[PDB]
Structures are given as structure tokens and as C-alpha cells.
Amino acid sequence: SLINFTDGFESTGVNQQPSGWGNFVGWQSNNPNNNIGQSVYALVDNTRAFTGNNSVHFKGGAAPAQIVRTLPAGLDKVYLKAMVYMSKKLGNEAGDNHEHIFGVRGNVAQADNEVRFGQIKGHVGTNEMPSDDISPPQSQWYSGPEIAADTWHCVVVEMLGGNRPYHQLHAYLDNQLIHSIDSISDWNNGGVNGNTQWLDGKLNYAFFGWHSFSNNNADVWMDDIEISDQPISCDSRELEH
Amino acid sequence: SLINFTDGFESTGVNQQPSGWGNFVGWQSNNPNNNIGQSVYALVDNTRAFTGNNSVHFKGGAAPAQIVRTLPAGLDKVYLKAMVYMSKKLGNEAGDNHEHIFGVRGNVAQADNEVRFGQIKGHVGTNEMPSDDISPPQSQWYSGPEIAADTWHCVVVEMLGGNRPYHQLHAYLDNQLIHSIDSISDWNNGGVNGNTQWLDGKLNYAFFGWHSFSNNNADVWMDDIEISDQPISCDSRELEHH
Ligand SMILES: [Ca+2]
Ligand SMILES: [Ca+2]
Ligand SMILES: [Mg+2]
Ligand SMILES: [Mg+2]
Ligand SMILES: [Mg+2]
Ligand SMILES: [Mg+2]
């Protein structure tokens, strides 16, 4: 209703930043050096794709490599979805700090006010900034469902904000629930400093890519991105490839 | 002489960013949220100092916390100096990736074109971006001189660029030489991609603070910072012979 967006990257040339998207590359919003000569980039690639010719290829690590899209004013909730292919797994990973593929941010220039989905402490899940809280709690770290390397996955994240008693997040892999934030006790460290409305101010930009706080370089490809304020799920082709 | 700058932080109020410096805090140049309410900052502090009442207190980690000074155009060399007090050590440290306290950068917006002195792979030394090369080589890693936690140190970094056959860096602790780069074989990964003039374009901004690529939070205090195109050293008081 406020946004119904899809992108398969098919109209953008190879080695170019996806048309219509901004970037967050090397900790800089709209880095002017997002190009195939750098070690960190977010560029269209026609050598791997889920549909059509093209995907977006993120090459990064500790230095983020992301595309970023503005979200409409007044969103209460958002759904992020993509076909995702990664060089390493997420989940069930000893030694991890945290790493993420999808998120929303409040301020374009900074990664210090955002919600980050991928894994935390080696379990699929979420990190919020600026609290630096993480979900799930410590009991579940370094275990749980895996998002395997070297295959296409259909990943969906639902973020429910606005006028409800407690903001929520649900993440899915191939339409199976793999992570939930339903109440304050789903956070490790006291629940985003006690803020029940913890998506407030976060839904200004959507971002996709690779960002590791575990010192791991990766290559990630995404295709068939969808962003909506109404629910999204994976279709027969995305499930059964 | 184009620059001969000293700062003891005595004229700035406590909890304020040092007057006349820029910042690089949480990966943003001149971050407007550099204040005592945040988890990452670079602020004047009177709870510890080497001279007078005040030092600059860096609180950071993976997220950098730094002050930044613009350097004059056309430097061929620069010396960076400070009294430094750290919550953890540099050097002789197992499992370290790299971390740094001093540096110079070419472009104010990014940490991807700079020279970084502190430790690399647990030995005191230097990391260059964008090559990501490190000095000394692998044989010396996780060993060598220590810059101990919880005491004041007088640290000097000498960077020699310009028209010489190979750019050099030397670092000194209490006037003792602890780290040198003066030949391509001092680099682990084959020498900044072959660039003999590897300080070219790097002497635009000097920075001081804490930045870990080893996921270590720290608190660092510095006092009596100096920047110059002529040599800088430590006086007997700074050496703490007592
Ligand atoms: Ca496509
Ligand atoms: Ca002082
Ligand atoms: Mg699949
Ligand atoms: Mg669809
Ligand atoms: Mg001393
Ligand atoms: Mg002096």
C-alpha cells in the first residue's frame, strides 16, 4: 500500500551499481568509488543470477558492501525479501560475533542507527544499533538453523512497528520461520534499553548486502529483491529450484 | 617549517571535543554526535592527564574514536607524538589482527587511504590502506616489544616521504626505536603492491585515537600531542626515569 517494490537488476549494465539504488560501501553512504577495481563493492553481475541475466554482487567483509533504497514516510511495518547466495553460511557457527545481510536504517550516513538481520553470536538473528543488543539470548548462541553457503535461498524478514504494544521481527528461510522477536525477553541484554517501540525511526532506508563484525570476507549475490508494507513470501520457483 | 603544533587540551572544557580538532568517530568524519552520552567518543577528560588537568579520552573499539588535524599542503615528512595511556597493551599479543593509535590519511571521509601505527598481528607496527599490507613480516608476529597497559608512554612516529628512493617509517617508545620500515622486504605481503613512494598522498590529515580491527574495546588517553615537519622527541619528564 505505501510501497510495493521489486528489482531483478535486469536493466543495469554489468559492473555498474544497481540503477535507482544508493550504496553503503566501505562505511560511506553513496561512496563514489563503488566499482570493479576495488576490493569492496556492490555491483551488477551477469555471471550468476536467480532469474534473468543479472544479480547484484556484494564483495565485502568487515568493510560493508550494500545497496540502499529510501522507504516512504509513514511506514509502520516493512517486509524485506531476496533470493540470496552466499560464500559462507549464517547460523550454527562457533566463534561468530555477528554478521548481516538485510536491514533498515534511520540515517543514511551512519550504521549506528539500524536493525541488522543475519546472525548474532553464531545463531540466525538480529543486532540493533545504537543499543548493540542482540536476539536471541545467550542460551541459543552458536547453534540453530543454518543458512547454508553456495546455494540460492529465499529469505524474508517481517518488521512490525507502529502502534502495537511491542515491536516485533520474524525471519524466514524458504517460508519456514527461523527467528522471532516477540517480547523483551527475546533480547540478550535487557531489550534495546527497555524500548518497546524499538523500530521507531528505523524505517527510513532498506539495505541489502554483506557486513561482517566477525572479520569474515564474503561474496554474496542477491536477486529478485522485494520490499513492501504488505507481506511477501517465496513462490514455487523460489522454493523448488 | 610548515607545521609545529602542540596541544595539552587545557583550554577545552571537560566532556567537549578538543577545540580546533576535527573528529573521526564511528566511521564518520566530524560526527556531530561526539559526546559523553555515546558509547564511542573523543572528548576532553580531567580524570587523568600527563601535564596539567586535562587529556583527550578516546572510547572506542571496532568503531574508531579519533581526533583529526588538517596538515599543510606539500609535506614531504611528518612527525606525530603524544603521551599515551591505554586500557590494554600493544605488541606481544596473541590472536591480534591489527589495531592503531596514530596515523595519517589522504581523504578525510574514509579510513581506506591511510597509514596506521600501533600493532599488526600482535607485534608493534604498521598497516597501510588500501593495500592492507602490514609490517613487520610473519616471522615476527605475536611477539616483540610491548607498549604496556595502564601507564604513560611517550610515542613518536616519524614518516619520511618525498623524493627518496624508498619511503620510511620509524616508531619510538620513550625515544627507543621499536619499529622500522625502510625496505620493501619489511612488508609481509610483498610491499604495498610494489609502491616505493608509499606515503604519496597520505600526509593530508593526522589522526590520533583508538581503532581496533581485533574487536577490542579500549579507553585511551593522550596528552601533550605534537605534530611537526621537523623532528619531535621526548623530554626527561616524559621519559619518566623515576
Ligand atoms: Ca535477475
Ligand atoms: Ca594536559
Ligand atoms: Mg534454495
Ligand atoms: Mg515474489
Ligand atoms: Mg612511561
Ligand atoms: Mg614536547
Residue numbers in the entry:
A (entry chain B): 3 to 243
B (entry chain A): 3 to 244
Quote the passages of the study that discuss this structure, keeping the authors' original sentences.
We therefore set out to characterize two previously unstudied proteins from the shipworm symbiont Teredinibacter turnerae that were initially identified by the presence of carbohydrate binding domains appended to uncharacterized domains with probable redox functions. One of these was TERTU_3803, which contained both a CBM10 and a CBM2 domain attached to a range of distinct modules (via flexible linkers) that did not bare any sequence similarity with catalytic domains typically found within carbohydrate-active enzymes. Using a ‘module walking’ approach, we searched for other genes coding for these X-domains. This led to the identification of TERTU_2913, which lacks CBMs but contains predicted X122, X183 and X132 domains. Taken together, these sequence analyses suggested that TERTU_3803 and TERTU_2913 could have a role to play in cellulose metabolism, and furthermore that role is likely to be a redox one given the presence of cytochrome domains within their linear amino acid sequences.
In addition to our work on Ttpf08450-X173, we produced TtX122A and TtX122B, representing the X122 domains from TERTU_3803 and TERTU_2913, respectively. The electron density was readily interpretable allowing two molecules of TtX122A to be modelled in the asymmetric unit without breaks in the chain representing residues 3 to 244 of the protein coded for in our construct. Three molecules of TtX122B were present in the asymmetric unit, with chain B’s electron density most readily traced allowing modelling of residues 2 to 235 without breaks in the chain. Chains A and C had some areas that displayed more disorder, so there were breaks in the model between residues 190 and 192 in chain A and residues 162 and 165 in chain C. In addition to protein and water molecules, two magnesium ions were modelled into the electron density on each protomer in TtX122A based on coordination geometry and bond lengths [Fig. S4(a)]; these ions presumably bound from the crystallization medium. Our subsequent structural analysis therefore focused on single protomers from each structure. The overall structures of TtX122A and TtX122B reveal that these domains adopt a β-jelly-roll fold [Figs. 4(a) and 4(b)]. Since there was limited functional similarity between the proteins identified in our structural comparisons, we performed a sequence alignment of 648 X122 family members and mapped the sequence conservation of each amino acid onto the surface of TtX122A using the ConSurf server. This revealed two significantly conserved patches on the protein surface [Fig. 4(c)], one of which was located around the calcium binding site implicated in stabilizing the fold, whilst the other forms a conserved surface on the inner face of the β-jelly-roll fold centred around Arg118 [Fig. 4(d)].
